[PDB]
Amino acid sequence: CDEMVHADSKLVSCRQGSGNMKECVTTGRALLPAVNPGQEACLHFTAPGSPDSKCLKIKVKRINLKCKKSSSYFVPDARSRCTSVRRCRWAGDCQSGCPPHFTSNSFSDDWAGKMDRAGLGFSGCSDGCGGAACGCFNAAPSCIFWRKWVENPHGIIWKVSPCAAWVPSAVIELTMPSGEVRTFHPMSGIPTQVFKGVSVTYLGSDMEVSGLTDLCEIEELKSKKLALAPCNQAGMGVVGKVGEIQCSSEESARTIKKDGCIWNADLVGIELRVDDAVCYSKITSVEAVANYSAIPDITAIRGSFSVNYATCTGEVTNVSGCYSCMTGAKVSIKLHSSKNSTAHVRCKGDETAFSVLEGVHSYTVSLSFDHAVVDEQCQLNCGGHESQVTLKGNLIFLDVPKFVDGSYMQTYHSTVPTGANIPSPTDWLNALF
Amino acid sequence: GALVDGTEFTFEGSCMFPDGCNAVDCTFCREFLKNPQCYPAKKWLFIIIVILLGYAGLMLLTNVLKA
Secondary structure (H helix, E strand, O other): OOOOOEOOOOOOOOOOOOOOOOOOOOOOOOOOOOOOOOOOEEOOOOOOOOOOEEOEEEEEEEEEOOOOOOEEEEEEEOOEEOEEEEOOOOOOOOOOOOOOOOOOOOOOOOOOOOOOOOOOOOHHHHHHOOOOOOOOOOOOOOEEOOOOOEEEOOOOOOOEOOOOOOOOEEEEEOOOOOOOEEEEOOOOOOOOOOOOOOOOOOEEOOOOOOOOOOOOEEEOOOOEEEEEEEEEEEOOOOOOOOOOOOEEEOOOOOOOOOOOOOOOOOOOOOOOOOOOEHHHHHEOOOOOOOOOOOOOOOEEEOOOOOOOOOEEOOEEEEEOOOOOOOOOOEEEEEEEEOOOOOOOOOOOOOOOOOOOOEOOOOEEEEEEEEEEEEOOOOEEEOOOEEOOOOOOOOOOOOOOOOOHHHHHHHHHHOOOOHHHHHHHHHHHHHHOO | OOOOOOOOOOOOOOOOOOOOOOOOOOOOOOOOOOOOOOOOOHHHHHOOOOHHHHHHHHHHHHHHHHH
């Protein structure tokens, strides 16, 4: 990490549960600047006692523009089927005036009341055929009873959410001092508070923003692909929108059986005849109805932490080349220490702090820095102070040393410098007077 | 544009480790000018040469054109 901020350990309350290794519990607030993408930021922990300390690494990966699912709804593929039982009068004995009340769930006419494979389809009588043609010999007309199903034989289901906004956000990986690594996606353009373990990260700087029309995302459960649309959504299905049936259980999203999902008045196309009714529909598929595209200061708040708690040598080996490049040069150090520990800043490095961690062997862990000239002095790394010094010529963005062609053009530029003034001085006397 | 330039992708390959090596020869624009040199008046003197010699070449061209 290049940008590094230490904690504010002035909150001190540590219980000496064990004498060999201490224990402490603390909280607070912190303000660390946003790191460049592709790099991780640190956070140093300090204790009044010397030997032990820990760290916390916050890694960013990406910058992008997503929006948060304010709602969520499922959409099945509706189909319109309709039956017709055709009694005739005095044989169904149905009332001369059709009963204006209709029981929309049972239908005692055809097998009492059971599960209906429709979602609240309607009911009704009709006009009446009567006479020798329909054959049941009564003069007065006959009522007919009809159903409508909204059905889904082999659905393809879409879940949708109307954020109707766009704010920058990023990708974060986190490193608990214990050693845990838990991923999550913070909407750090909005002061959202994601909860995990003990810590919570929140807002950053919206260094650029943009506007966009009323669009939101369409996704498929088999995952055909991902689609975008105007994507209107509310508690109800408004006329002419993408989503008519808005249904709130995936396990019940194959059929239509949960009550949560809500129909449209007179949506299904029932039409009558002289004998029996036929099915039609006016619903629209999600595609090609209204489609406008087709897809081809990070800071944290601290909770009640679970903070936990000799001879050591540095022994550098080499130096790389970067000054004034956005990543810095990488340096390798070969250490050994009898304990598992963490290191700290070199004072004279004059660029950034340190936060290394080691195992009990001889290893190397390499970190990134940039300088005009190597000094590398004054580090209180681990256990005891050590003053090691390096030396190497650093590499910077310069011109080409390979051919020294610019040297030839440098010699040509300085041509006849005194000659021009010499001709100018004689002309100056004439021009001035 | 690093030297090794080796990185990872997480869908199915699961973060492998490539190796690379690059020289730095490209466009030579830079805010800084030239570079630090020992000089010590052994190198500066060699840099400075006769100035009238450059004027001599242009002088001969003027003689031929008029002639």
